[PDB]
Write a protein that binds this ligand. Sequence first.
Ligand code: NI
Length: 341
Amino acid sequence: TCPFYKKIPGTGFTVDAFQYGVVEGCTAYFLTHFHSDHYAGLSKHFTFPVYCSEITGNLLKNKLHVQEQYIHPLPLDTECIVNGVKVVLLDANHCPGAVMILFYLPNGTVILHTGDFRADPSMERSLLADQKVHMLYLDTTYCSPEYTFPSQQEVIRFAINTAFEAVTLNPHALVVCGTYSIGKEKVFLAIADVLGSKVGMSQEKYKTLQCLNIPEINSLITTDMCSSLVHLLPMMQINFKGLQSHLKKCGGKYNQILAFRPTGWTHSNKFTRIADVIPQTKGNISIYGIPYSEHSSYLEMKRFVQWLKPQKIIPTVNVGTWKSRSTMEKYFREWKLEAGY
Ligand code: NI
């Protein structure tokens, strides 16, 4: 049964609600982004209208085989009418094709559903600037002040400089980057660019990347692993056993692996600066965990909310425990008192 926080009152609409069977009263199913916790339940047999971005639509058709007649892609930053309700899709600064959704209810209420997002000051000059929002359905993944991490730009700077140093000292080192879903493509693209290499990967992952409208992508990626010195592997294989095994398969082309695990936040964030991060090493293999986030830090989230001044906030993440819910409600009240809305 669909939870209440995936239902948009006053409409026939649901958001990221594909694992509940047929939802009673739902005339259109929105999907914010192609991540499995959100698409769970979609397949080639789905026969209700799905509304999403162009990129999300390419992935539904090619990866999940949803039939084309049920996929309704919408342009960003454009007022559209869906089942007689005005909507707009805005970039969520999450993974490729990820959106926030603005709904303009027939009765005058305006609702923003952030989907998954990384808040940024640039959002303060989208179409949000022009009107009031009554209700905010908010990605509260990291809604606690202990959650700090660097900018995506600092994290990429660290990774490029790390990789370029290692391979310049040893031309026979391989770089490996872990992945398990779309998102964080800049990690492996920026490293391959500094090394003058294409990124090599499985056919299934190459397929996924070909759905994403990234400019000049044929220039950046390949299925020929032998021609590449930056390889992508499933995240689960980014350990000493998995990497030893991979190095065996490269036929004595390489004699060292330097590997990256993009994570979200991890508790070493409370003690260490990005500049100071060090790998785990075993023999000729080193593994760096780097805090490349595609969700808001606590400070970014707070800044966004205090700018938007919504009348009601509905969390969409961390809602399963009373202690979580109570924690988040306390911060929302502080924010409101500090800012005066
Ligand atoms: Ni996500």
